Design a protein around this ligand. Structure first.
Ligand SMILES: COC1=C(OC)C(=O)C(CC=C(C)C)=C(C)C1=O
Ligand SMILES: [Zn+2]
Lengths: 188, 134
């Protein structure tokens, strides 16, 4: 009647268990992903339509940045542990893409320093099992939803996101029209 | 036709190729797509409807319909992004064939071991391709 596979979402062919209820991917290099979050804040937006306390997770990925990508991931992974994410997303996007001032593990290190994370406390867990586990939890979460590009989104690990099912001229609209698709798939 | 394309087709297929590997190995997902909006047409545009016989050259005009059409935008878009980004989009490093047309990305991406020209010549090799034929 009015909500379609291959249109605004696609249904995942081989659907993955134990999955996060909703889960996004992104690199700190894809100007698009940068848009997705920097410019349109889509997460925050989407966060808000979601039902009572339904887990909204978010993983970073490797292909873009060879050596650094990984550490960026590992680094990130930390922020997942310390529940710091919210305070580092933005320095990092910026540091990496926009400011072009990030080159090494430490430039990054320093950003956690910068954002209210203690240089030792941010290393205490960096090498911790907590993190290492988490990295893989990602490395493998991509691999599971047979992933090719970013940013990307998937609901209860069943439904990948067709953002082309939607407007491309009006932001204000596309967003809400986006968050909708997600809500819809959260009770399906 | 055949030759004038093949002569040049080769000379640009390989201008990619010849150097693809000498180019060490620059990243690209548009890569294939566009190199396929190439070899998908030229190969089967020589062989197309100018073909093994020349008294039926309209199958190619069709093969030159959906040809550099993509060839145009495949580069067109591709380059539209390169300084001018957009949310409702991606950035990958991956194979795909929505009907099991599979081998194609276990070979030409595989046995591969500057947007400037492409974008324009994908459209340059279009109006001239249409004018003289249609
Ligand atoms: C950015 O990605 C791409 C390339 O870079 C390695 C190419 O060389 C080529 C092919 C190059 C020539 C000169 C035909 C294409 C089509 C492409 O999309
Ligand atoms: Zn903003």
């Amino acid at each position: 009647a009015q909500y379609e596979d291959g249109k605004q979402y696609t249904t995942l062919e081989k659907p993955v268990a134990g999955a996060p209820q909703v889960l996004e991917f992104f690199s700190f290099f894809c100007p698009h992903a940068y848009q997705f979050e920097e410019v349109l804040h889509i997460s925050d937006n989407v966060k808000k339509k979601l039902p009572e306390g339904v887990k909204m997770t978010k993983y970073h990925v490797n292909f873009m940045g060879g050596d650094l990508g990984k550490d960026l991931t590992q680094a990130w992974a930390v922020a997942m542990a310390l529940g710091v994410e919210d305070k580092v997303t933005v320095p990092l996007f910026e540091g990496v893409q926009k400011t072009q001032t990030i080159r090494s593990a430490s430039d990054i290190r320093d950003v956690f320093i910068n954002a209210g994370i203690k240089g030792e406390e941010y290393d205490a867990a960096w090498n911790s099992f907590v993190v290492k586990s988490l990295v893989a939890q990602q490395e493998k979460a991509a691999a599971d939803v047979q992933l090719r590009g970013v940013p990307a989104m998937f609901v209860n690990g069943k439904y990948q996101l067709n953002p082309q099912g939607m407007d491309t001229s009006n932001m204000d609209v596309f967003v809400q029209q986006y968050a909708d698709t997600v809500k819809y798939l959260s009770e399906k | 036709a055949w030759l004038l394309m093949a002569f040049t087709a080769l000379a640009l297929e390989l201008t990619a190729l010849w150097f693809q590997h000498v180019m060490l190995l620059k990243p690209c997902v548009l890569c294939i797509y566009e190199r396929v909006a190439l070899f998908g047409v030229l190969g089967a545009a020589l062989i197309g409807a100018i073909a093994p016989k020349t008294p039926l050259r309209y199958v190619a005009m069709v093969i030159w319909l959906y040809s550099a059409f993509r060839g145009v935008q495949l580069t067109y878009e591709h380059t539209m992004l390169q300084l001018y980004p957009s949310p409702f989009a991606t950035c990958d490093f991956m194979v795909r064939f929505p009907e099991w047309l599979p081998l194609d990305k276990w070979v030409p991406q595989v046995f591969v071991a500057m947007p400037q020209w492409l974008l324009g010549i994908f459209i340059a090799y279009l109006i001239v391709a249409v004018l003289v034929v249609i």
